[PDB]
Design a protein around this ligand. Sequence first.
Ligand SMILES: [Cl-]
Ligand SMILES: [Cl-]
Ligand SMILES: [Cl-]
Ligand SMILES: [Cl-]
Ligand SMILES: [Cl-]
Ligand SMILES: [Cl-]
Ligand SMILES: [Cl-]
Ligand SMILES: [Cl-]
Ligand SMILES: [Cl-]
Ligand SMILES: [Cl-]
Ligand SMILES: [Cl-]
Ligand code: NA
Ligand code: NA
Length: 129
Amino acid sequence: KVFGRCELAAAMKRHGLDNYRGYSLGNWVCAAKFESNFNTQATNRNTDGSTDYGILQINSRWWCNDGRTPGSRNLCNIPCSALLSSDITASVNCAKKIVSDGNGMNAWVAWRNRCKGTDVQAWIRGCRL
Ligand SMILES: [Cl-]
Ligand SMILES: [Cl-]
Ligand SMILES: [Cl-]
Ligand SMILES: [Cl-]
Ligand SMILES: [Cl-]
Ligand SMILES: [Cl-]
Ligand SMILES: [Cl-]
Ligand SMILES: [Cl-]
Ligand SMILES: [Cl-]
Ligand SMILES: [Cl-]
Ligand SMILES: [Cl-]
Ligand code: NA
Ligand code: NA
């Protein structure tokens, strides 16, 4: 599924990401835009041979099992394919674990490089939330 911007904002708010560990909703929408272009089916291979899955590009090195990432962990206890669902529940719940892991949203390289230090409230401007 390709979400609309405000559609995703609303779904992420429903699931309690608004100010989760202090990150306002615009941070999460910004991260999704640059990670997946709001497309749940996005996959991208990393240089280390791991793959990133779904709307928030969650990586198989640490977080999900895709059966082809040697020496990897599965800390969200989920098949990676479940992160491609039109239902974002598994992605959000896993993202909550990642962002609590010590480095905040800096875990998402696209957030650090494209969202951090910018006016992220722009990403939810005009949305009825
Ligand atoms: Cl929308
Ligand atoms: Cl957009
Ligand atoms: Cl914030
Ligand atoms: Cl915001
Ligand atoms: Cl790729
Ligand atoms: Cl497997
Ligand atoms: Cl694996
Ligand atoms: Cl393969
Ligand atoms: Cl594990
Ligand atoms: Cl959803
Ligand atoms: Cl933090
Ligand atoms: Na990416
Ligand atoms: Na894994």
